Design a protein around this motif. Structure first.
Motif, PDB file in Angstrom:
ATOM      1  N   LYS A  60      14.167  -1.348  -0.295  1.00  0.00           N
ATOM      2  CA  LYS A  60      12.993  -1.782  -1.069  1.00  0.00           C
ATOM      3  C   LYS A  60      12.162  -0.632  -1.640  1.00  0.00           C
ATOM      4  O   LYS A  60      11.280  -0.873  -2.456  1.00  0.00           O
ATOM      5  N   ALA A  61      12.436   0.608  -1.231  1.00  0.00           N
ATOM      6  CA  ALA A  61      11.706   1.770  -1.761  1.00  0.00           C
ATOM      7  C   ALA A  61      11.854   1.882  -3.286  1.00  0.00           C
ATOM      8  O   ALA A  61      12.954   1.706  -3.819  1.00  0.00           O
ATOM      9  N   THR A  62      10.752   2.158  -3.984  1.00  0.00           N
ATOM     10  CA  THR A  62      10.780   2.238  -5.442  1.00  0.00           C
ATOM     11  C   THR A  62      11.493   3.507  -5.855  1.00  0.00           C
ATOM     12  O   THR A  62      11.525   4.487  -5.108  1.00  0.00           O
ATOM     13  N   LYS A  63      12.045   3.493  -7.058  1.00  0.00           N
ATOM     14  CA  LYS A  63      12.688   4.677  -7.628  1.00  0.00           C
ATOM     15  C   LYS A  63      11.718   5.879  -7.720  1.00  0.00           C
ATOM     16  O   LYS A  63      12.127   7.038  -7.648  1.00  0.00           O
ATOM     17  N   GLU A  64      10.428   5.595  -7.845  1.00  0.00           N
ATOM     18  CA  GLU A  64       9.401   6.635  -7.911  1.00  0.00           C
ATOM     19  C   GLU A  64       9.162   7.255  -6.527  1.00  0.00           C
ATOM     20  O   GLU A  64       9.038   8.473  -6.396  1.00  0.00           O
ATOM     21  N   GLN A  65       9.117   6.425  -5.486  1.00  0.00           N
ATOM     22  CA  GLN A  65       9.105   6.948  -4.101  1.00  0.00           C
ATOM     23  C   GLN A  65      10.295   7.886  -3.820  1.00  0.00           C
ATOM     24  O   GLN A  65      10.136   8.954  -3.223  1.00  0.00           O
ATOM     25  N   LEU A  66      11.477   7.461  -4.261  1.00  0.00           N
ATOM     26  CA  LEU A  66      12.744   8.157  -3.997  1.00  0.00           C
ATOM     27  C   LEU A  66      12.868   9.477  -4.767  1.00  0.00           C
ATOM     28  O   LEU A  66      13.371  10.468  -4.238  1.00  0.00           O
ATOM     29  N   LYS A  67      12.414   9.479  -6.016  1.00  0.00           N
ATOM     30  CA  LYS A  67      12.376  10.693  -6.814  1.00  0.00           C
ATOM     31  C   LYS A  67      11.513  11.780  -6.156  1.00  0.00           C
ATOM     32  O   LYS A  67      11.910  12.946  -6.107  1.00  0.00           O
ATOM     33  N   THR A  68      10.355  11.383  -5.635  1.00  0.00           N
ATOM     34  CA  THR A  68       9.444  12.318  -4.958  1.00  0.00           C
ATOM     35  C   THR A  68      10.065  12.854  -3.681  1.00  0.00           C
ATOM     36  O   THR A  68      10.087  14.063  -3.470  1.00  0.00           O
ATOM     37  N   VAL A  69      10.546  11.954  -2.830  1.00  0.00           N
ATOM     38  CA  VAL A  69      11.235  12.363  -1.596  1.00  0.00           C
ATOM     39  C   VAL A  69      12.388  13.317  -1.906  1.00  0.00           C
ATOM     40  O   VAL A  69      12.531  14.337  -1.231  1.00  0.00           O
ATOM     41  N   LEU A  70      13.189  13.002  -2.925  1.00  0.00           N
ATOM     42  CA  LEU A  70      14.314  13.874  -3.281  1.00  0.00           C
ATOM     43  C   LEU A  70      13.821  15.217  -3.827  1.00  0.00           C
ATOM     44  O   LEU A  70      14.422  16.255  -3.570  1.00  0.00           O
TER      45      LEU A  70
END
Ligand SMILES: [Zn+2]
Ligand SMILES: [Zn+2]
Ligand SMILES: [Zn+2]
Ligand SMILES: [Zn+2]
Ligand SMILES: [Zn+2]
Ligand SMILES: [Zn+2]
Ligand SMILES: [Zn+2]
Ligand SMILES: [Zn+2]
Ligand SMILES: [Zn+2]
Ligand SMILES: [Zn+2]
Ligand SMILES: [Zn+2]
Length: 577
Positions: free
Chosen positions: A531-541
């Motif tokens: 459920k994590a947003t693509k924006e959450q994931l971009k930052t984490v990455l």
């Protein structure tokens, strides 16, 4: 023909005959060393020559499948190395051949063919035949459905590269370019074989009608039909391992196209004054001809004619084939699958309307049903190209990895990364092109990447949603995939710290291989927090990337990873809630 093997040997010539037989045996038997194959080739070829001398000699009247299968079934260490194939060898033809075909491995997992300039230039100069033979062998086993004649063409480019450079920075970028052509070409043919296998010969013909009509808008329906009929047979033969017949029939087709090129296309001139292999290749890759000035208005025939329902009942296959031909030649700015979806919508309208009381009033607006079908992929391509051009290939690939991992989180991480990376290279290829060529470039290439995913899914099924999209309809495949959202029935993959834990080994890797490691972690991030947003994931990455760049720049690389790594691993999960 008294002896088929003799006939093909006489038609093709020895060099091409040996090349094609080597390909064919390397594809059926993917694990065998180069010597097991070369010996089989040489023996088969010796028999062909004997038969060419006297076609009444014993065994010369046997079918190609019988002769080739019998040869394959003599191979040393058959049951241990080729368990499944040994079972096939108990059968007679054509059951045996069908068994061999059923067991080709699309994901054989062999080492990447890394170029060693010094070593290979040395092996080339001492024995070119062996060296070029080896290239055919190495590519064939890696790509079992690779188009046989095409691989010979590409072997000749491989030869010119080593002939030019060897007498090593000349050589590396030439081989990099060639490998991309091998990849693309392999993906195109596999789609054709996949289409025969999963949807049948009608589907391959319709695809071909649409594509060839786009390429050759000057040609009449008879000429396109002719070429499609012959080209469909060539592919049927190449996809079913009948490589001699495939090569021979491809050569005859090239000849016909070139003898009738004034009727077919003005772009064929460059192709038609070349050697046999080069000729067939140029034709297959030829650019689309300019639109003729006398393309007919289609509304009168296909929307306004009062007897349309009668036409659809009395000569259905020809009425629809004609529509597809006419609509396709007129629309080189459309993808092939879009054209096919349009044709299916046209057919469904003439089923619906003709069963009503007053059909003309019903089918009158049939062309207006195409409008939403055209707009959907146009918006998708605009949106994806806008993103690509803003963020670049790496981040674009990352966005596609997230998008597709959400759709099918059960798929393996290497598969998700492969497909996301391939999908992202479509951006680089297509988005820079002239604006009217983006749609066909983007969707057609997308069809190739989705088929690869579908083929891998045949071997390793993990997802009913993927099965449906892959098997329900060839033309609807891309929109089926696009319509998938987060699989809500998926239970998040359990957390393993070590999956997200990096070490100093990453630092020595080439750029693309660093990316794959981070992209793999990205897929894993999505699997654990779907459920994590693509924006959450971009930052984490982003944070993972900064951490890798820092510790790879460190005096003591591993102490940096060991200190900094675990904190980032635990904190990153809190960012994905
Ligand atoms: Zn024959
Ligand atoms: Zn040839
Ligand atoms: Zn052996
Ligand atoms: Zn390859
Ligand atoms: Zn090619
Ligand atoms: Zn072809
Ligand atoms: Zn066959
Ligand atoms: Zn009519
Ligand atoms: Zn293309
Ligand atoms: Zn590691
Ligand atoms: Zn990097």
């Amino acid at each position: 023909h008294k002896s088929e093997i003799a006939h093909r040997f006489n038609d093709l010539g020895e060099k091409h005959f040996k090349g094609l037989v080597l390909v064919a045996f390397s594809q059926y038997l993917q694990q065998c060393p180069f010597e097991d194959h070369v010996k089989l080739v040489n023996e088969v070829t010796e028999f062909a020559k004997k038969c060419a001398a006297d076609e009444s000699a014993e065994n010369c009247d046997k079918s190609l499948h019988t002769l080739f299968g019998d040869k394959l079934c003599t191979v040393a260490t058959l049951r241990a190395t080729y368990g499944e194939l040994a079972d096939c060898c108990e059968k007679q033809e054509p059951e045996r051949n069908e068994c061999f075909l059923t067991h080709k491995d699309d994901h054989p997992n062999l080492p990447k063919l890394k170029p060693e300039p010094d070593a290979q230039c040395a092996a080339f100069q001492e024995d070119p035949d062996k060296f070029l033979g080896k290239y055919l062998y190495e590519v064939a086993r890696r790509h079992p459905y690779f188009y046989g004649p095409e691989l010979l063409f590409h072997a000749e480019e491989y030869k010119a590269d080593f002939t030019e450079c060897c007498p090593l920075a000349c050589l590396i970028p030439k081989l990099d370019a060639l490998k991309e052509r091998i990849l693309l070409s392999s993906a195109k043919e596999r789609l054709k074989c996949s289409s025969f296998q999963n949807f049948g010969e009608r589907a391959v013909k319709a695809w071909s009608v649409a594509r060839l009509s786009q390429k050759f808008p000057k040609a009449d329906f008879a000429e396109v039909s002719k070429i499609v009929t012959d080209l469909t047979k060539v592919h049927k033969e190449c996809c079913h391992g009948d490589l001699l017949e495939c090569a021979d029939d491809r050569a005859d087709l090239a000849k016909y196209i070139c003898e009738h090129q004034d009727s077919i296309s003005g772009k064929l001139k460059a192709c038609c004054d070349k050697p046999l292999l080069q000729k067939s290749h140029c034709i297959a890759e030829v650019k689309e001809d300019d639109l003729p000035s006398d393309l007919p208005a289609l509304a009168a025939d296909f929307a306004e004619d009062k007897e349309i329902c009668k036409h659809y009942k009395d000569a259905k296959d020809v009425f629809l084939g004609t529509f597809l031909y006419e609509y396709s030649r007129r629309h080189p700015d459309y993808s092939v699958s879009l054209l096919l979806r349009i044709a299916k919508t046209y057919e469904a309208t003439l089923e619906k309307c003709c069963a009503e009381a007053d059909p003309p009033a019903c089918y009158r607006t049939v062309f207006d049903q195409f409008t939403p079908l055209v707009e959907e992929p146009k918006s998708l391509v605009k949106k994806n190209c806008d993103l690509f051009e803003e963020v670049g290939e790496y981040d674009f690939q990352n966005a596609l990895i997230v998008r597709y991992t959400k759709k099918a989180p059960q798929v393996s991480t290497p598969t998700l990364v492969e497909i996301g990376r391939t999908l992202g290279k479509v951006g680089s290829r297509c988005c820079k092109l002239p604006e009217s060529e983006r749609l066909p470039c983007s969707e057609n290439h997308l069809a190739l990447a989705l088929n690869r995913l579908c083929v891998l899914h045949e071997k390793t099924p993990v997802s009913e949603k993927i099965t449906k999209c892959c098997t329900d309809s060839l033309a609807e495949r891309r929109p089926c995939f696009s319509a998938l959202e987060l699989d809500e029935g998926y239970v998040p993959k359990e957390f393993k710290a070590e999956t997200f834990t990096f070490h100093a080994d990453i630092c020595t890797l080439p750029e693309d291989e660093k990316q794959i490691k981070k992209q793999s972690a990205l897929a894993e991030l999505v699997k654990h927090k779907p459920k994590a947003t693509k924006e959450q994931l971009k930052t984490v990455l982003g944070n993972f990337s900064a951490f890798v760049a820092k510790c790879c720049g460190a005096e003591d690389k591993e102490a940096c990873f060991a200190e900094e790594g675990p904190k980032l691993v635990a904190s990153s999960q809190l960012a994905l809630a």
